[PDB]
Amino acid sequence: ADREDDPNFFKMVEGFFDRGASIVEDKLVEDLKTRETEEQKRNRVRGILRIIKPCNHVLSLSFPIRRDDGSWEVIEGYRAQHSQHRTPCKGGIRYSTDVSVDEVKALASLMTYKCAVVDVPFGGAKAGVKINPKNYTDNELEKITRRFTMELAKKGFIGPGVDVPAPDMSTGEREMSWIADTYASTIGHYDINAHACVTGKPISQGGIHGRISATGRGVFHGIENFINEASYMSILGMTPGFGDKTFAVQGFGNVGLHSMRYLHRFGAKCVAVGESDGSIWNPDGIDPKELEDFKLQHGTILGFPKAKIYEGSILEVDCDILIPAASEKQLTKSNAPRVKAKIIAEGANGPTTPEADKIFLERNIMVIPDLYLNAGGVTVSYFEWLKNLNHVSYGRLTFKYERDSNYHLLMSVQESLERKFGKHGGTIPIVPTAEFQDRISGASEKDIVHSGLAYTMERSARQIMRTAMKYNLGLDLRTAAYVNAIEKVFRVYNEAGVTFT
Amino acid sequence: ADREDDPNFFKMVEGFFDRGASIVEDKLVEDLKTRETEEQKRNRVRGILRIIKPCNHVLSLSFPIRRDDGSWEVIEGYRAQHSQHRTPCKGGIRYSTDVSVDEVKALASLMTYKCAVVDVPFGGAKAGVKINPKNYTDNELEKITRRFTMELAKKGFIGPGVDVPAPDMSTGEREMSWIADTYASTIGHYDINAHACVTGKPISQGGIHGRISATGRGVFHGIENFINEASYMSILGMTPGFGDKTFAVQGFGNVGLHSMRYLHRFGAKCVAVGESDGSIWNPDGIDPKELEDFKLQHGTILGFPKAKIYEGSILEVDCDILIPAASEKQLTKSNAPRVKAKIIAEGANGPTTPEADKIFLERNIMVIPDLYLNAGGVTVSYFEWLKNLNHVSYGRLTFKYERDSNYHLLMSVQESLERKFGKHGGTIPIVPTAEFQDRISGASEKDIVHSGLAYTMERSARQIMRTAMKYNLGLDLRTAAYVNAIEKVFRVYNEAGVTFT
Amino acid sequence: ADREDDPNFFKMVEGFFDRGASIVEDKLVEDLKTRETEEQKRNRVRGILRIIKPCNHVLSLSFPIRRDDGSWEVIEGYRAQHSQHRTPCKGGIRYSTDVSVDEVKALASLMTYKCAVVDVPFGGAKAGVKINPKNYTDNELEKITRRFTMELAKKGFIGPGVDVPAPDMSTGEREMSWIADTYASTIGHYDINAHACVTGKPISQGGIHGRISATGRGVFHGIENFINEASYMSILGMTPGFGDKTFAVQGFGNVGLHSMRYLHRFGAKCVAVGESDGSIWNPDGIDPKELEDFKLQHGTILGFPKAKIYEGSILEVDCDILIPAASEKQLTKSNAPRVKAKIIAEGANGPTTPEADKIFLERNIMVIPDLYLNAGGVTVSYFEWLKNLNHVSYGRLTFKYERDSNYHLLMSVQESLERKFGKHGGTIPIVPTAEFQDRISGASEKDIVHSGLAYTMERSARQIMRTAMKYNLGLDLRTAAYVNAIEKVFRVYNEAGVTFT
Numbered sequence A, B, C: 001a002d003r004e005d006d007p008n009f010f011k012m013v014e015g016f017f018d019r020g021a022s023i024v025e026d027k028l029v030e031d032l033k034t035r036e037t038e039e040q041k042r043n044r045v046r047g048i049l050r051i052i053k054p055c056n057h058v059l060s061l062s063f064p065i066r067r068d069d070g071s072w073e074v075i076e077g078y079r080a081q082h083s084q085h086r087t088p089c090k091g092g093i094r095y096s097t098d099v100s101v102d103e104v105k106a107l108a109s110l111m112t113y114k115c116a117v118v119d120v121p122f123g124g125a126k127a128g129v130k131i132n133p134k135n136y137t138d139n140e141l142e143k144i145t146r147r148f149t150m151e152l153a154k155k156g157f158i159g160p161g162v163d164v165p166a167p168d169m170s171t172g173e174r175e176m177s178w179i180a181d182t183y184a185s186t187i188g189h190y191d192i193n194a195h196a197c198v199t200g201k202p203i204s205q206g207g208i209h210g211r212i213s214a215t216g217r218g219v220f221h222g223i224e225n226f227i228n229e230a231s232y233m234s235i236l237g238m239t240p241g242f243g244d245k246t247f248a249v250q251g252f253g254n255v256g257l258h259s260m261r262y263l264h265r266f267g268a269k270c271v272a273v274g275e276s277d278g279s280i281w282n283p284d285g286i287d288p289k290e291l292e293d294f295k296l297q298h299g300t301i302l303g304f305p306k307a308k309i310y311e312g313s314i315l316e317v318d319c320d321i322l323i324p325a326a327s328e329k330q331l332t333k334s335n336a337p338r339v340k341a342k343i344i345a346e347g348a349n350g351p352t353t354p355e356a357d358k359i360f361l362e363r364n365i366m367v368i369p370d371l372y373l374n375a376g377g378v379t380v381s382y383f384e385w386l387k388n389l390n391h392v393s394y395g396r397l398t399f400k401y402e403r404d405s406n407y408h409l410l411m412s413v414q415e416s417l418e419r420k421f422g423k424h425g426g427t428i429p430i431v432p433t434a435e436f437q438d439r440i441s442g443a444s445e446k447d448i449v450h451s452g453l454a455y456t457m458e459r460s461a462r463q464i465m466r467t468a469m470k471y472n473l474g475l476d477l478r479t480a481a482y483v484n485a486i487e488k489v490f491r492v493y494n495e496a497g498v499t500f501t
């Protein structure tokens, strides 16, 4: 944590909201079409906005575990539900000591708008268990998450139609596998959609292909849709395309390692990788498979053979693209001036504070907002959810038919040409290309996740680029996204009676 | 209400049934394949029909509401469930003072067969609140519908697997939005499919695209599949096609305004529009998107600038196509002789009495039965229901695949032709037509509703036509449909053990 | 609120706990009699205590309500569940702007121990809606409490087997009547014990007789069982009995008005009555009937004809018995020295801060702790709960039999005496006393509440006086009660496996 700029997390995000609130407030009043045409529209609007911002529910939990050494310990744990204009709430579970109600109240709100950015029909939620996970044995961490699932389940803070958790900092597949198993074996025992109570699950447990990457893949697609738009690259003095760029990732977690993977593939170079014990550095480039193989073996990126330890801030590393994939409030009024990079891809949830945004705005530094960029996590989870509702491995019922249908479709183009060009004209083979033999049978689960994600990271980037052009926000994409989110979320409340009253 | 021919509504529809009962009774005994082959196939057919006819359940409600002026008023309200061979029951909620148990017992039965016509897997239900809706403020109407939802929910007359209401006379999106919200926030709180308890919902609440039109769109498709079949147009002395026809709609509601829009588009020309205060007239033609703009501004069609006020019965207006989109029992023994028109498109539920059919039959006037023609309402609702069960905006998971798949499919026809015609023969662009660029990504929700509706108005007309031919009913399409309905509904009961026993 | 001594409410009560924790900790280790006889008895004890004090659950609610002026307002509202070693949780709903999570987290904990004092089998809960109740119309307050009931019900914070609210500051019968009706008409629709979800209900809604008084009656019994124990009155230099005492109540609510009535009856004299706008005074005595009749007419005690607008603090009024029946943290490090009274009857929840206790301890001033004294509220509620479970007006099934049975019992003592004293001895009437003709039919609901309450305000004062003698706490009755509470609550956790594990 910084000290000059350590603003309250929930209020920080409220700040981003209130900015977007004013910018559409005019429009919201204008398409509102009611017979109370006045400032009655504006105060109805202002009221509905005042309903949106604050979380609807926060549950606070002091529950006992018995540690491995026979002793008793009390665990603090929270889960804020921000909005519910879309049931079920969505949002991850975070294991940290940083965990605090305001931090979960903040992340939950982010999940509300984050889903509105990428048109996932979930209300925002989040949750923290206030433990250093590296200080508990795996059997302790199991007892902890299972128990946390119960106490959440009993008070209605996890359920396939109510609230669907997912992984986050220091939680992953393993934790999610537990959360399902408790609720499948206990309270959700008769629930057919039980297993749909939580995403990020291991594939064998009902998870969806590529969800672990997903968030980092979406990070790729997000940087891409902009870095291939010279209208913005003209404003950063940078060339369109990944081919020649250099980047740096703070954090090497599920968002870091895979944001590094998907860029080091589709073009650019990794220069430096951070972690909560220090960074490594190499301007020549760092291979993600080597580094990961070194973090698996030795549990730290420090001392990488092919990369010098970097003395100094990872955020300040000279590069093209800065990807904070760590915790929040990392780039602040004091170090934001020194960032000597040109694209900020917020992988992490709110890693940049509003005072860093004003510096980055001035310094013509493009911050790709947290709302849009890591929405790949929720999006693939949103798929994982529909998978557990449709109870089928995607693609299975149809494969051998949009297959045979295609081969018959092709055989029509063929017979029709032969039918016209007689025998003499020859026989005219109509045959799938190489990049159509791989789709000849249609959508597999792998593919849907990719294109389904690819679509809406591309789809929702335009919706932002539209709005940044429209209201003339330029490189203030963060306000551009909150403008879209605030509008979509409002769209529900307005056409609803707003409350059962 | 007429005086000479005001038959009991439920018995009226029973009349239509009993007619269809006899006509298939032979067939039903015929494919019955049991070894009790006698005329006790007949009596267990005659028993199963006797089970179908009468409603299974009717709930009668005297519930208090406090009005706006602090005072108390008791509200009468009914919901008959006709059959349940398909759970969940389906059928709308009607707000009128005409509302009476017989009238709801009648409409409910209609919904049973109506769904059997267009192969929607719902049992028939309906409901009335016995209020003049203009005489209550919107806040009164809210507390009325919400309370009515409760008392229906508690006694098991609304639930996604039990009974799914929808709009009807003097109810629409707004009411449906309330019905969902109460049951979502109250009794259905844990129900994942809660919002699937009621159709006609606003799009933002889980509704489906085009449901408000839908019923009137289906009215278009219904008239079409017949008016484009000279085999019937030879029998009316009329030319195939919409291009030159003139019509008149009694009622300007959801069924009227949209039956007018979809015909005034796809050809014919509105001559006169009725309402519960009088009709307007103009042989030259009436534009729906002037008249609607006049009804929105001024709350009445009367005094339309481009149409004088018409001087007599709207049903008697000289025209080609008469579309009653009002309440029931409108064309009777007494005014049926003077209907000066050639095609009767029953948009409303049972607007023509059996004695009017006897005249229209004689007078070679084609009545397109209520069962078939307005089944667009239930059909799109049936879609709205599946949408709330599948929890996805249709088309989303696949768009960028049957897109990329098609572009690759095309690229196969291309490469294969080039692969045969060398560099000699050029490069052969294979490129979607204009029409096909709009489908290149596949089914959106807009499209599915259209084609999904278009298909079954077209699949079910040509189940009626090839029963009216079969048992030689000619222009008695009403008996033709009830013959289909009675058969499909039978089939369930026959293959079932018929009851818990 | 004071400034010098305004300690955190939760932590304040934790302070009272930690005191009691140490004092029994030895005993708890002592009768523990496990294999692991060590300081492992002590650390499993210290662990179980660490599980007890922190609340198990807190739910935080921002829910909207339409105000009367059509506008929207968001309502903050919380409900902490402290412990659950006894389901269902019990504890009131408080309407104030003082409402804050720490204040509800504090009161909830108090309810845990308060029930343990008077052997009510409920875990501690509490709840606040953060509104000034003056500032909302009754129709607003209805749509506020009903909505608050829903959001509490949905997340599992009200239910006959889960959590049973009750009235508190600025809530009473009316609010409780609403809470029942919503949950009876909505979520608890099929619940047979639905109306047992909340106590303090109006008699007609399932309430129990004397519950409104109850808390103030118990305040009488509590002062009594001590003021009639010269062993403590020798230590205050005061005479045993009520006959000659004088007393002052801060607050005139349900706890004030009825603590004043029950003492002004059974002996002593009211000298001064406080309220959030000032106090009245009269050393000669104040009649509760006249005052109440003044407050009903004029909505304030100020300007009482037979009593003097008192300059200065009500708490400092010269008297024998000071009854704070207001909000908490009223007697602090700064005004506690000035209290020139001798018995402090904590009617309100925690009206005295731990630094005031130190002074009062020194100044030999007997503080009758909040745990014990106002436990009449929960006790009669606990009865109201059992009444809604037994679904009978108490006494009904038996009246005409312990009646006829006693008249026959009497007739046996008679016939047996006559049988021995022949005719030479007369006829010997055996006849109930006047004080037995009123019990001749046995327990009515009125009586059970009285004696059922009377008993356990005795039976539990005894258990405190036992323990204050035992561990030699003298006039530290507060620590004496927490000692008893901590012990009873512990014996559940000890004999339990302590958790899901």
Ligand SMILES: NC(=O)C1=CN([C@@H]2O[C@H](COP(=O)(O)OP(=O)(O)OC[C@H]3O[C@@H](n4cnc5c(N)ncnc54)[C@H](O)[C@@H]3O)[C@@H](O)[C@H]2O)C=CC1
Residues within 6 Å of the ligand: A085, A086, A087, A088, A115, A116, A117, A118, A119, A120, A121, A488, A489, A491, A492, B195, B203, B204, B205, B206, B207, B387, B388, B389, B390, B391, B392, B393, B394
């Ligand atoms: N609330 C419900 O009715 C429940 C049903 N579902 C289903 O999930 C799907 C929801 O997708 P839709 O929002 O209807 O389609 P959509 O994203 O294409 O938007 C269609 C309409 O919903 C609003 N909207 C647009 N974007 C939105 C966004 N990110 N968040 C909230 N509202 C937005 C707008 O009013 C728009 O007119 C549907 O299939 C729904 O039936 C899922 C949970 C509960």
Ligand SMILES: NC(=O)C1=CN([C@@H]2O[C@H](COP(=O)(O)OP(=O)(O)OC[C@H]3O[C@@H](n4cnc5c(N)ncnc54)[C@H](O)[C@@H]3O)[C@@H](O)[C@H]2O)C=CC1
Residues within 6 Å of the ligand: A092, A167, A168, A169, A170, A171, A211, A212, A215, A250, A251, A252, A253, A254, A255, A256, A274, A275, A276, A277, A325, A326, A327, A328, A330, A347, A348, A349, A350, A374, A375, A377, A378
């Ligand atoms: N797992 C997922 O699917 C999703 C995670 N996110 C978000 O990305 C951010 C991090 O998430 P993950 O990558 O999954 O966490 P992670 O727990 O998998 O990885 C964190 C690693 O980076 C290090 N680290 C943590 N904080 C640091 C800090 N301030 N400075 C330097 N190093 C630090 C830690 O040593 C740790 O080893 C959060 O904002 C999270 O909400 C984004 C969407 C989905």
Ligand SMILES: NC(=O)C1=CN([C@@H]2O[C@H](COP(=O)(O)OP(=O)(O)OC[C@H]3O[C@@H](n4cnc5c(N)ncnc54)[C@H](O)[C@@H]3O)[C@@H](O)[C@H]2O)C=CC1
Residues within 6 Å of the ligand: A195, A196, A203, A204, A205, A206, A207, A384, A387, A388, A389, A390, A391, A392, A393, A394
């Ligand atoms: N316990 C669960 O969650 C299961 C129920 N479903 C639902 O669909 C989703 C999972 O899709 P799948 O049908 O599993 O995809 P799938 O047919 O492509 O195979 C699933 C994965 O688990 C393995 N697997 C395949 N068949 C299995 C079987 N009968 N039993 C156990 N493991 C098997 C496979 O090796 C594969 O990697 C989940 O969300 C789930 O709710 C279907 C299977 C898993």
Ligand SMILES: NC(=O)C1=CN([C@@H]2O[C@H](COP(=O)(O)OP(=O)(O)OC[C@H]3O[C@@H](n4cnc5c(N)ncnc54)[C@H](O)[C@@H]3O)[C@@H](O)[C@H]2O)C=CC1
Residues within 6 Å of the ligand: B092, B166, B167, B168, B169, B170, B171, B215, B250, B251, B252, B253, B254, B255, B256, B274, B275, B276, B277, B325, B326, B327, B328, B347, B348, B349, B374, B375, B376, B377, B378
């Ligand atoms: N909305 C739907 O889902 C469908 C409705 N229907 C039926 O169509 C009819 C119309 O109802 P909706 O269009 O749904 O809503 P609606 O209530 O808005 O339509 C009513 C229209 O008919 C007028 N009207 C009432 N009584 C009249 C009378 N004696 N003479 C002339 N006009 C009169 C009304 O003033 C208004 O113009 C109903 O009978 C309904 O059962 C049939 C299937 C689908």
Ligand SMILES: NC(=O)C1=CN([C@@H]2O[C@H](COP(=O)(O)OP(=O)(O)OC[C@H]3O[C@@H](n4cnc5c(N)ncnc54)[C@H](O)[C@@H]3O)[C@@H](O)[C@H]2O)C=CC1
Residues within 6 Å of the ligand: C092, C167, C168, C169, C170, C171, C215, C250, C251, C252, C253, C254, C255, C256, C274, C275, C276, C277, C325, C326, C327, C328, C347, C348, C349, C350, C374, C375, C377, C378
């Ligand atoms: N409702 C119940 O059954 C019982 C209530 N309590 C506690 O007793 C106290 C209040 O009794 P209530 O039930 O609330 O009846 P109440 O809410 O009607 O009493 C409040 C009265 O005291 C006044 N008041 C409030 N704050 C004051 C302050 N700082 N100074 C002077 N006057 C003030 C109010 O204006 C009002 O006249 C609270 O601490 C309550 O939690 C505990 C035992 C039983």
Ligand SMILES: NC(=O)C1=CN([C@@H]2O[C@H](COP(=O)(O)OP(=O)(O)OC[C@H]3O[C@@H](n4cnc5c(N)ncnc54)[C@H](O)[C@@H]3O)[C@@H](O)[C@H]2O)C=CC1
Residues within 6 Å of the ligand: C195, C204, C205, C206, C387, C388, C389, C390, C391, C392, C393, C394
């Ligand atoms: N299940 C329910 O919601 C209703 C039935 N009950 C149940 O019984 C218990 C309450 O005992 P009670 O019989 O009400 O005490 P109760 O019978 O002594 O009522 C008090 C007086 O009011 C009159 N009274 C008697 N029964 C009445 C009734 N059913 N309704 C209105 N006035 C009546 C009588 O003259 C009686 O003397 C509660 O547990 C409750 O569950 C009482 C309230 C509503």
Ligand SMILES: Nc1nc2c(ncn2[C@@H]2O[C@H](COP(=O)(O)OP(=O)(O)OP(=O)(O)O)[C@@H](O)[C@H]2O)c(=O)[nH]1
Residues within 6 Å of the ligand: A209, A210, A211, A212, A213, A214, A257, A258, A261, A289, A292
């Ligand atoms: N954590 C981690 N995951 C990997 C690594 N390499 C591949 N994956 C994962 O492998 C999964 C499936 O991989 P593939 O079958 O090769 O298909 P892919 O989706 O094209 O592989 P990637 O693009 O790297 O995701 C994806 O979810 C990736 O996240 C790695 O080095 N570390």
Ligand SMILES: Nc1nc2c(ncn2[C@@H]2O[C@H](COP(=O)(O)OP(=O)(O)OP(=O)(O)O)[C@@H](O)[C@H]2O)c(=O)[nH]1
Residues within 6 Å of the ligand: B209, B210, B211, B212, B213, B261, B289, B292, B446
């Ligand atoms: N009331 C009313 N609604 C309209 C009108 N025109 C379009 N709509 C709305 O538009 C919806 C479908 O419109 P489109 O998306 O434009 O589809 P289209 O193929 O271009 O043609 P239509 O469906 O006839 O409008 C309808 O369900 C209506 O909600 C109109 O003139 N009056």
Ligand SMILES: Nc1nc2c(ncn2[C@@H]2O[C@H](COP(=O)(O)OP(=O)(O)OP(=O)(O)O)[C@@H](O)[C@H]2O)c(=O)[nH]1
Residues within 6 Å of the ligand: C210, C213, C214, C446
């Ligand atoms: N708020 C309020 N409650 C009252 C008042 N008078 C009576 N009550 C309630 O009604 C009950 C009936 O009281 P009583 O006539 O005294 O008979 P009781 O129940 O045996 O009480 P005791 O005679 O004192 O033992 C009381 O105990 C109170 O709970 C009053 O003036 N104000």
Ligand SMILES: N[C@@H](CCC(=O)O)C(=O)O
Residues within 6 Å of the ligand: A090, A091, A092, A093, A111, A114, A164, A165, A166, A167, A168, A199, A349, A374, A375, A377, A378, A379, A381, A382
């Ligand atoms: N925790 C991730 C993913 C949440 C989810 O997939 O539901 C996020 O906040 O974006």
Ligand SMILES: N[C@@H](CCC(=O)O)C(=O)O
Residues within 6 Å of the ligand: B090, B091, B092, B093, B111, B114, B164, B165, B166, B167, B168, B199, B349, B374, B375, B377, B378, B379, B381, B382
């Ligand atoms: N009320 C319309 C619609 C019914 C429905 O969509 O459920 C009808 O009777 O056809």
Ligand SMILES: N[C@@H](CCC(=O)O)C(=O)O
Residues within 6 Å of the ligand: C090, C091, C092, C093, C111, C114, C164, C165, C166, C167, C168, C199, C349, C374, C375, C377, C378, C379, C381, C382
């Ligand atoms: N609110 C009162 C009464 C609680 C109850 O009766 O449940 C108290 O805290 O003691």
